[PDB]
Every structure is written in structure tokens, then in C-alpha cells.
């Protein structure tokens, strides 16, 4: 099996340097993800993704492509423990919040990190998420990571990676470790590469949005809201000009003569009514476009912010952009072959009608055995 | 770039969602099946679901499709142990991958990196083969997209990035204009001007009178009375509602989206079906699966991906299956094979 | 100038005592630079000639 010699040594030679514990995300990216959590549209979209992912239900189960008759559910008690932990991770945190934090950090930075506490026999004790901003990792000499540093100076735990850790005689680890699930990008560099996050390509629209809204706020208070710029002449005996002013003024709602005409005997005064449009202060047209851009870059049908579009948002960006990477990352190293983490699609409320109609239509067919009619719509056996 | 990245990761995500497996091929005329061991085939299944550690099959598909879209090339590396049993597969960074040609017509080795590490991985053409034909040592693929004037490998890349330089540059120019004009244009109204005979000192009084009608002022909302010395106000329009040039911007977006082959509507369900079985299926799925099938396994067996794993095609597959069920002048096996379902 | 978004007095009036200054706002249409109408026609032509 494992040959230990991958072709990613192209970068540790000179393009990188070993034993340095380089951080995983540039500080600029951290600040951008930080201030993007206060922006209206960006926060709305981010917690929309988080909520949608957080709603799905977990379980461990037999995998469909079980060619491995030598099933890797090493104990079938480790599998029960993994089920337990997938429903209840570390105390003071539930599985739902784990999913939410994981999906959120995946959307902001394109990374997912964790920590496990398998007791002594592959029985995982609890799982903790890792804060991507202040998580550093250290590389080997060949091509990959060995340890993760978490924090700057006082606490300095170099948690080992899953690659190097005291394994069981079957292959399962014996001590703690970490994951660092990563999203690919161009030019390979599996871990030495640059993050791949939507925040890369929305700096321009978010800055434009903030500029327009600042203009709107400033112009809201600062523009005089008065009408009737009335002006008399430089021959009016200032003292009956006050009388004319009181006459003009005392027609407000709830005045002495309210609603009646103004009569001016001699000395023509001249009124002009100010428009004070003030109906485009936020620049509605070049603002909804920035909103549409920073929404679509997150992969959210505009209509969300009809039911066909909800189905689309579910099985176009949530399913193959947060669900498959997370479940494949967990399945890759949390359990042996033949078993892996799965989530029930029929727990999604938007897909229920479609699943039912598909099931009925397949029921109508005959040139298909029952087991495949099942497996084409979930329902393993 | 906003639009280009959106489209690129859209393609990557869509391709990354499809499920692999090795299986009997339909056009199995080769009764001498090339699944040389049927244990190599199990190992290839294993690897197709779990490639090299610290990377899953889904991420392999994503990176492969992405690099195929950007450069029109796909490269890989295999580590078959000693008997055609592949150990792991690694993708190759196209930017810094160099290749060397033979004397007749084709590649022999791939150089990966500039100076320190210098592994000349052999091509699949020349490598220590098994007595059946399978290789024994490592090798690489370099799947290539064809173009005009042949030159199978000596040719120029064929990528959408060739024909979108103009629209992306125009888009960036318009957005830079918009940003610059957003901050820089005074956002004030009421350019009010008095005369050069006003005793500068009651001009300040007139200014305070005009000013103290803002929301939350002493006399807020009431009239302005000016006794003598007519002051003259003009209200500035400050349109500022076309700074990004909406019309000659959506066109550039449409162009750099359609050149990637994405129905505009995506950025209804009929259009999703179209995007699936018009540009994703015959532009990323067939080339990748034919490249893998060409040299990863013998004849009679090849890599296939289940179309019914695509969520957009399920209703169509079900309706087609029912309609075919209604026919009679067709045996059962062909009713199956016309809709997947091998045997 | 100091009424731009993020200035000292941002959004308030301009008061000029004497010496009337004269502002004119430029249109800067710039919304037909590509000539949308006599461009989609060329696109339609070189698409239909390919039979699409």
C-alpha cells in the first residue's frame, strides 16, 4: 500500500521551508471574513448557508459502493460510539452547531478543521472544531502536514495530523489528531495553495455597496427638509416683514387661520417651492446590482431574497458544495471502508414532494427488480 | 474576477457532485476481458473512491474539471504497486508541468518543477509493462483537448479564457469607473449662493437659518423667510444611478458566461436540465471518463459515472422509464439498456 | 470637495457669499458604448450562418 512518495515535494524544496508552522489563512482574509459578518447582505447569505446546512440529519451507515467485503467497521462498537458522537459531540455543543460552524468556516475560508479524542481502541470520545483564523500547521519533508499548532504562545499543543499518529493494528488511530479539510484550487499545491472562497471576488461589490449606503446616510440628515423658500424685498420696514412671516406661518395644521388664503397688500413677496426629491439617495439601481452580485457569488438564487428556486438552491449549491465535501472528509478518516457518514436527504423539507413523486413513478415501472427500485431512491435494503 | 470565478466554481461544483464506479462496458465486443485480474479492478474501485490520502475522489474531480476549464489540459500520476494494482493517484499542477517529446511523434517523460526536485515521470506510452500490457511503475496522463491543425500535443491550448479577454477587461474598466465615481462626486444638494453685498456676518445668519431645518433642528420643517437681499438656491440633481453602466455591463457578463457554456437564467428547470446535458455532460464528463478508461484499465471494463446520481435528471429518467415500460415490441433487456440498468 | 462621503461636512449645503460660482452637471451617458443594437445583429448573423 502506502508509498509515502507523492509529487507535492515540488514546493517544500525551496518554494517553502519545513518546520515553521505557517498559518493557514492570510490575515487580510481573516479581516475580510470578520467585517463581512457585519455587512447586511453578506451576513444574510452566510447565515442562510449555515442554517440550511445545519438542518440536515446525520447517521453512520453501510456505504453503497461496498466492494470491500472485509468491512472496515473494525469493531461495530466503534461504529456505535461514532453514531453517538455524531449526534452528541463534546459537551456544551450539539451536532447541529458543529455542522453550522463547519459550513460557515468552509464558506468564509475554504477550510474545515477538527480534533478527535479516540480513547484507546478507535472509540472516538468527542470532536471539537478548530478556529481557522488562529490555526497554524507544519509540513513534513516529503509533501504533507504532520502537526497543527493552535495558538501563539502560552498554550502550544502540536496536535498530530491523521497521517502520522499511533495507529491501531488495524489502522485506526490511538491518540488525538486533526483534519484540515481543504478546498482545491488551480496549480494544485494541495495544501501550499491559496484559499478558494467567495470572499475573494466580492471586495469590489461590498465596497461599492458600503460607499452608496454611506452617501445615503449622509444625505438623509443634512439636506434641509423645508419647503417654501419665501423672500421679501429690501424695502419692507423690517417689523411688518415679521407680520408677513407670521401670516404665512400661522396656516400650519393647528393654527389660527389654518388653510385659508394669504393676502398681501402691496410689496409683492415671492415664494418658490423646493422640490427636495430625496427619493434616490441610496441609488436603488446601482445597489440592487451589487446585492445580486454578492448573493450570486455565494450561490443563492436571487428569488430567495418560487419553490422551484428553493429546490434549485438545495440541490445545486448546498448539496454539492457543503454536504458532499463535509461527508466525504468525515468518511475519509473517521471510519473504515464499508461504512461512512451519510445524511438523509428525506430530512430536507423542500425535497419531500419530489422524492414522493419519483418513488411513485418508479413504482409504475416493471422491467426493474425491487432492490434497484429501492436503491435508486435511497432505501438501501 | 466576480463573474469568471462564479462560473468556474459553478462548473467545478457541478462536476464534483457526480459519483464514480468501475463497471462492464456496454460495447464489450472483447470477450477476452481486459480486467486482467478482477483484483486490480477492486483496487481501482477503491482508489476511485479514495485516492491518495488527504484527498478524496470528489476533490480530484473538482480540481481536474477546474484545470480542464482553465487550460484545456488534465494531468495525473499513478503508483501501481507491482501487478497493475494502482496504489494512489495524484493530480498534477498544469502551470508548472513540463513535458519532453520523443523522436517520432509523442511524449516520453514529464518534468514537474524547475530545479531542486526533478522527477521525469515516464509517460504511459513508454513504461515497464506487465506481460499482459499493464504498467509496473509510475506514469502520467496529460489528457489534452483537441484544436485546429491537429498537432495533437504540439498544438495551442483550447480554453474559454482565449476569447474573453475583451469582455473581462471591459467589465473591469466599467467597475473601476463606478468605484471612482462613487466616492468623489459631492453628495450635497442646495448649492445656495448669496450676493457680494450682504455684510458677511449676516450671511452667516442666513446660512444658519437655512441649515437649522435638518431633521432634528431648532426650526425643522418650517419655511425660510429672507427679508431683502434675494438669495438664490438651485437643487443639484446628482443622478448617480448609472455609475456602473448597467446596460454595457450585463452584456459583458452574458458574454463571459455564455463562453463558459452556462445558460443565462442560471445567474427555469428546463434550463438546468440544459446546462446539465449540454455542456457538463459532453464537455467535462465524457472527456474525463474516456481519458481514464483509455489508460487506467483493460478493455471490457472502464470507468463510468451514474447519471441517476444527478439530482436534476431524476424526473426525466423516471418519465422515460415509465413510457418505455408502456411499449411491448421490445424485449426486456433492451428496455433496460436504453435507460441505464445494464443487466 | 469636502462633502464627499466621509468628509468633514458630508451631505450638507454649500453656501457661497458673493461671487456667484456656476456648476453644470455632466451627463456622461456611456450606456451605449458597445452599440447594443448593431452588435446583437452581427452576433445573430455569425451564429445563424453556423446553423444555431
Residue numbers in the entry:
A (entry chain U): 16 to 320, 334 to 409
B (entry chain V): 54 to 320, 334 to 409
C (entry chain W): 264 to 315
Task: Paste lines from the article.
Caudovirales, the taxonomic order for the tailed double-stranded DNA bacteriophages, is characterized by the presence of a tail—a host cell attachment organelle that is connected to the genome-containing spherical or elongated capsid via a neck. We describe cryo-EM structures of the neck, the neck-capsid and neck-tail junctions, and capsid of the Agrobacterium phage Milano. The tail to capsid junction involves a symmetry mismatch that is bridged by the neck, and is therefore crucial for the assembly of tailed phage. The extensive network of disulfide bonds within and between neck, collar, capsid and tail provides an exceptional structural stability to Milano.
The 15-fold, 12-fold and 3-fold symmetrized maps of the neck were used to build atomic models of the collar, portal, and neck devoid of capsid (portal + neck 1 + neck 2 + tail terminator + collar), respectively. The structures of portal, neck 2, and tail terminator rings of Milano show considerable similarity to their counterparts in other bacteriophages at both protomer and oligomeric levels. The β-sandwich domains form a positively charged “bowl”, which houses a negatively charged portal clip domain region thus strengthening the connection between the portal and the neck tube. The lumen of portal, neck 1, and neck 2 possesses a positive electrostatic potential resulting in a positive charge of the neck lumen —suitable to hold and position the end of the negatively charged linear dsDNA until the genome release.
